[PDB]
Amino acid sequence: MNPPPPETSNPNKPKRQTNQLQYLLRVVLKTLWKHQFAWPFQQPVDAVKLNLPDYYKIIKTPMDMGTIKKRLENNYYWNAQECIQDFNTMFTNCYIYNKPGDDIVLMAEALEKLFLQKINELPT
Numbered sequence: 001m002n003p004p005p006p007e008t009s010n011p012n013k014p015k016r017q018t019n020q021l022q023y024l025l026r027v028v029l030k031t032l033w034k035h036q037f038a039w040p041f042q043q044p045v046d047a048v049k050l051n052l053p054d055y056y057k058i059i060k061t062p063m064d065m066g067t068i069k070k071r072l073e074n075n076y077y078w079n080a081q082e083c084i085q086d087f088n089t090m091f092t093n094c095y096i097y098n099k100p101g102d103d104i105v106l107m108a109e110a111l112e113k114l115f116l117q118k119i120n121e122l123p124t
């Protein structure tokens with residue numbers, strides 16, 4: 001059984017459009033999406049399809065790049081830090097559910113380095 005996926009809209013949450021959030025979509029997310037290791041992270045973890053019945057027993061704050069992409073497109077975030085926190089939650093969940101040296105962890109490690117390279121400098 002899968003939980004409902006994270007929300008991508010919420011009417012009582014205030015929205016903002018900023019240069020940094022536009023760059024997080026155009027540059028950060030859309031470039032990481034194309035990496036050879038992006039595919040496990042492009043959609044919420046489907047525990048039924050992937051046969052991970054313990055995934056949501058361990059991961060209580062799921063996050064993925066599909067959700068982040070919709071949140072950016074739907075102007076869900078207030079600021080860049082809120083979006084950056086969702087990328088960090090996605091990487092940390094991968095480390096928590098797995099073990100050092102696992103293939104999925106090697107993938108998340110490489111994507112996290114690319115992510116940090118791209119958010120080291122943001123637009124004004």
Ligand SMILES: OCc1nnc2scc(-c3ccccc3)n12
Pocket residue numbers: 040041045050052093094097098104
């Ligand atoms: O490898 C476990 C795992 N941890 N985080 C993620 S996102 C996708 C997967 C996954 C699972 C099974 C086959 C292929 C990929 N995983």
